[PDB]
Design a protein around this ligand. Structure first.
Ligand SMILES: *CCC(=O)N(c1ccc(C(C)(C)C)cc1)[C@@H](C(=O)NC1CCOCC1)c1cccnc1
Ligand SMILES: *CCC(=O)N(c1ccc(C(C)(C)C)cc1)[C@@H](C(=O)NC1CCOCC1)c1cccnc1
Lengths: 304, 304
């Protein structure tokens, strides 16, 4: 028993982190097979930040200008290309520690683990969610760019995020491993305000099911609701609308606990309307939304 | 910027996890050099749980009764011994992935990462604290015993915890790597109630400093206090007494922010007396106590 914000074991990803330097900028790269992936802003200087023309800046760079170091050993760069907002540096050596991997583009509400790195070296691992406004609330300092987000299914690492920047509001933006930003963000030092950070309703419900499985049941009430009634309350509280797809996804949790999804929605509706009254659920005084129904099932079943 | 409950990268510890089976019980072991460490309750059956005599039960076990598997390959057990509540299984092969390591016995209030494992396979990593009542609030299911807690200093892993059991209240108890339980707990299926789970005051203050560094400053007030005045309030709220050692340890955070430790104590005193009023600090609606001053400095400076 017990329920924690759990990250995937990071070893498979640690074996892929390298340092990439171009000019005076040093950030992280992800070395898979004979390609090193990194944010294209590694080619930017102090005067490029504001309005960079990446194609023009890249013309002035050759393979030897990209310094890639894996541990304390230098990798030889034999090719380079820009794909959207990432650079792909072809090296002459396949990463011997390359795990089985996929590149996936996640949807908002989905969670993943981040291996925060500096100078190609791992500093820590934590669990994130892609917010509904396509930002992530991470913990990244200068030099953390190129750190990646991932999920693991048995022995296959699905990379879903590469860190690129911090918005002036302290929230984070990045791309998938094809270099496409999540949301409307651009790799430029300009005014980029994030949209409404709504709560991921299906994740809150999954976490309420995790709480029941763990003995925290005080919030269970004698009520039920409908999807339309619940959604009127969800809109009022900046919660994402709940769909029948979300109800279906919560099916295993509803089955395990014997609590119908709409009954849990009625509990969540009362928690939104009445508050917690100074009480806690799974050691939290707010409704946690960075656990998907899949995460709850996985943690409550011990998938390795 | 941003502040997350961050665990150490787990790769160095993943390389040490093995499966240990004795009779019908299978749990995890930690393989360092040519020794595999695991909870001694691996030798217990259904009728042993209630009042086991470990020395007597161990007499009926030989080296060949301990099945140790590292990945899909079997390790040959050439010796076994009991040290306090852990068994040490000498194998004929040194773990080739043994990192530089130490065994440390931590104090209450100290944090560490847990690599939760099942069948010798890692499932997840999360950050814990040794509570002042010597329990940990982890996330462990049946078969998670032998999962370990650790801290990392550059390339040296300091193992501090090995999971042994769950108390009837859903909190966890375990030993250091010498087999000595933290707190008064015993590896027996008996009434073991935990003491008062007080809040780790110095950690809450460290996290309030992390909040200021990250721009969350609404809770800063125009007041100050003394150690004795603050401690009268801390006692009332089941917070641990703050000592001059704790003030000294918070010195770097006080220096970086320019907020005297006693001024932060006065902010914490008002938060205890007035509550949060529906506000949040670093995305939390309660005062977080599982970040030490060292963790705050490390995360805010990017130590790899
Ligand atoms: C990894 C580089 C870095 O530290 N940061 C960064 C990223 C991108 C740029 C470009 C060239 C695209 C402008 C520059 C610097 C920052 C970062 O994103 N800083 C922003 C702060 C708000 O104004 C715009 C620049 C970084 C800091 C902390 C965390 N992650 C990235
Ligand atoms: C790893 C073994 C296991 O799953 N658990 C366990 C541990 C120790 C025992 C002895 C032989 C010492 C009695 C038995 C079983 C449990 C566990 O600790 N269960 C307890 C629940 C409360 O009553 C006492 C037995 C375990 C479950 C979940 C997490 N960690 C351990």
């Amino acid at each position: 028993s017990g329920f924690r914000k759990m990250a995937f074991p990071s070893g498979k990803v640690e074996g892929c982190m390298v340092q990439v330097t171009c000019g005076t900028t040093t950030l992280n790269g992800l070395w898979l097979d004979d390609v090193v992936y990194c944010p294209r802003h590694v080619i930017c200087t102090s005067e490029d930040m504001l309005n960079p023309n990446y194609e023009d800046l890249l013309i002035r760079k050759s393979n030897h200008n990209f310094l890639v170091q894996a541990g304390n050993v230098q990798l030889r760069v034999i090719g380079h290309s820009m794909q959207n907002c990432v650079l792909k540096l072809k090296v002459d050596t396949a990463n011997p520690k390359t795990p089985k991997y996929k590149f996936v583009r996640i949807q908002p509400g989905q969670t993943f683990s981040v291996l925060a790195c500096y100078n190609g070296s791992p500093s820590g691992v934590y669990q994130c969610a892609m917010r509904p406004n396509f930002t992530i609330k991470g913990s990244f300092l200068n030099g953390s760019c190129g750190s990646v987000g991932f999920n693991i299914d048995y022995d296959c690492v699905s990379f879903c995020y590469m860190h690129h920047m911090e918005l002036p509001t302290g929230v984070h933006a990045g791309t998938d491993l094809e270099g496409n930003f999540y949301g409307p963000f651009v790799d430029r030092q300009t005014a980029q305000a994030a949209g409404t950070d709504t709560t991921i309703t299906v994740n809150v419900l999954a976490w309420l099911y995790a709480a029941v499985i763990n003995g925290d049941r005080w919030f269970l009430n004698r009520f039920t609701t409908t999807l339309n009634d619940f959604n009127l309350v969800a809109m009022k509280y900046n919660y994402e609308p709940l769909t029948q797809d979300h109800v279906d996804i919560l099916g295993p949790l509803s089955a395990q606990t014997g609590i119908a999804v709409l009954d849990m929605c009625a509990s969540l509706k009362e928690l939104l309307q009445n508050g917690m009254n100074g009480r806690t659920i799974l050691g939290s005084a707010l409704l946690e939304d960075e656990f998907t129904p899949f995460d709850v099932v996985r943690q409550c079943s011990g998938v390795t």
